Amino acid sequence: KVFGRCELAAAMKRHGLDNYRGYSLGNWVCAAKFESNFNTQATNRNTDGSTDYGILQINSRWWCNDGRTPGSRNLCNIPCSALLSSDITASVNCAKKIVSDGNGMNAWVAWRNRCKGTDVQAWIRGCRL
Ligand SMILES: CC(=O)N[C@@H]1[C@@H](O)[C@H](O[C@@H]2O[C@H](CO)[C@@H](O[C@@H]3O[C@H](CO)[C@@H](O)[C@H](O)[C@H]3NC(C)=O)[C@H](O)[C@H]2NC(C)=O)[C@@H](CO)O[C@H]1O
Ligand SMILES: [Cl-]
Ligand SMILES: [Cl-]
Ligand code: NA
């Protein structure tokens, strides 16, 4: 599923991401925009053999099992394919674990490079939340 901007903002707010660990909703929408272009089915392979999955491009070396990333942890205890569902629940639950892991949202390279320090509130403007 390819979400709309406000549609995803509303879904993320419902799943508890607004101000989760201090990160306002616009941060999460910004990160999803640049990680996946709001596409739950996005995948990207990395040089180390791991693959990033779903709306928040969660990585298979640490967070999910895709059966082909040798020596990987499955810290969210889910198959990576669960992260491609039109229901973002699994991605949000796993993202909450990632952002609590110490480095905050810096774990998402696109958030670091394209969202951090910008006016992220712009990502939820006009949305009925
Ligand atoms: C969205 C996504 O999947 N992003 C991936 C990043 O999570 C990942 O960065 C590395 O993640 C691990 C796991 O969070 C980091 O290790 C943690 O480091 C902190 C302190 O630095 C420590 O408190 C945690 O215990 C430790 N986790 C452990 C030991 O399990 C690690 O620091 C992150 N970055 C680096 C450079 O190692 C990157 C890199 O694989 O991939 C993203 O896709
Ligand atoms: Cl907000
Ligand atoms: Cl933080
Ligand atoms: Na894994």
Side-chain angles (χ1 to χ4, degrees), residues 44-53 57-80 83 94 98 101 107:
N44 283 286
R45 195 94 192 253
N46 305 120
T47 54
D48 70 358
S50 65
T51 300
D52 300 329
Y53 291 88
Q57 289 291 274
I58 287 168
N59 185 266
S60 67
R61 194 170 291 299
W62 305 104
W63 305 108
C64 63
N65 177 52
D66 67 359
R68 69 163 193 200
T69 309
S72 73
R73 276 272 88 173
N74 185 5
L75 289 177
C76 290
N77 289 331
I78 47 160
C80 299
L83 300 175
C94 188
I98 301 175
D101 195 55

Side-chain angles (χ1 to χ4, degrees), residues 21 23 99 102-106:
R21 280 303 183 112
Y23 291 95
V99 73
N103 297 327
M105 285 197 74
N106 294 294

